[PDB]
Write an enzyme that holds these catalytic residues in place. Structure first.
Site, PDB file in Angstrom:
ATOM      1  N   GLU A  66       0.772  -1.228   0.000  1.00 38.20           N
ATOM      2  CA  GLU A  66       0.000   0.000   0.000  1.00 38.20           C
ATOM      3  C   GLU A  66       0.801   1.275   0.000  1.00 38.20           C
ATOM      4  O   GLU A  66       0.263   2.317  -0.319  1.00 38.20           O
ATOM      5  CB  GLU A  66      -0.781   0.043   1.302  1.00 38.20           C
ATOM      6  CG  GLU A  66      -1.834  -1.057   1.368  1.00 38.20           C
ATOM      7  CD  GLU A  66      -3.001  -0.931   0.418  1.00 38.20           C
ATOM      8  OE1 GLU A  66      -3.797  -1.811   0.249  1.00 38.20           O
ATOM      9  OE2 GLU A  66      -3.157   0.239  -0.111  1.00 38.20           O
ATOM     10  N   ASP A  85      -6.385   6.800  -4.660  1.00 37.70           N
ATOM     11  CA  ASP A  85      -5.938   5.465  -4.825  1.00 37.70           C
ATOM     12  C   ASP A  85      -6.007   5.028  -6.301  1.00 37.70           C
ATOM     13  O   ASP A  85      -6.385   5.802  -7.176  1.00 37.70           O
ATOM     14  CB  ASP A  85      -6.720   4.663  -3.790  1.00 37.70           C
ATOM     15  CG  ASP A  85      -8.065   4.076  -4.166  1.00 37.70           C
ATOM     16  OD1 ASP A  85      -8.653   3.357  -3.425  1.00 37.70           O
ATOM     17  OD2 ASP A  85      -8.500   4.233  -5.372  1.00 37.70           O
TER      18      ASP A  85
END
Length: 164
Positions: free
Chosen positions: A11, A20
């Site tokens: 991540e 994202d």
């Protein structure tokens, strides 16, 4: 290697709101803030989460705090889900980390939809389940990460991450 380091590799860490891979407002270590297109909605959710006026930016510490909560919530989520629980109980420690990774990324509900893959994991049909897991939007959208998780399920080792 442990679930925390594994997730931190997958991540990244960002101290400023960001979008994202799907276009949603995120901060820290993959903490989704909102699916809403408003950056204002995003900063609001952010301040609510941190307990202060953040103005879109957080410290390392705050990011790690969010991360600790999220890993914990993902695990408890698995343990409360009637489809996931049994799969989790049947797996070794490495593969467990793999399921937590999935659930962290795409919520309980999501993962719970990989019905066929879940069944194969449960039955310890490693190769077959790797092949089935790859037939998913998840794999198509984020292939390098999906491949790493997949490998983790197929082999039961942390090889895919030893690299990184």
């Amino acid at each position: 290697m442990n679930i925390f380091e594994m997730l931190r590799i997958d991540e990244g860490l960002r101290l400023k709101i960001y979008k994202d891979t799907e276009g949603y407002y995120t901060i820290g270590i993959g903490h989704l803030l909102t699916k809403s297109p408003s950056l204002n909605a995003a900063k609001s959710e952010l301040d609510k989460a941190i307990g202060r006026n953040t103005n879109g930016v957080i410290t390392k510490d705050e990011a790690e705090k969010l991360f600790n909560q999220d890993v914990d919530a993902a695990v408890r989520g698995i343990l409360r889900n009637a489809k996931l629980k049994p799969v989790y109980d049947s797996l070794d420690a490495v593969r467990r980390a793999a399921l937590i990774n999935k659930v962290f990324q795409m919520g309980e509900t999501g993962v719970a939809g990989f019905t066929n893959s879940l069944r194969m994991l449960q039955q310890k049909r490693w190769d077959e389940a790797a092949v089935n897991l790859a037939k998913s939007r998840w794999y198509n959208q984020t292939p390098n990460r999906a491949k790493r998780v997949i490998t983790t399920f197929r082999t039961g080792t942390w090889d895919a991450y030893k690299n990184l």
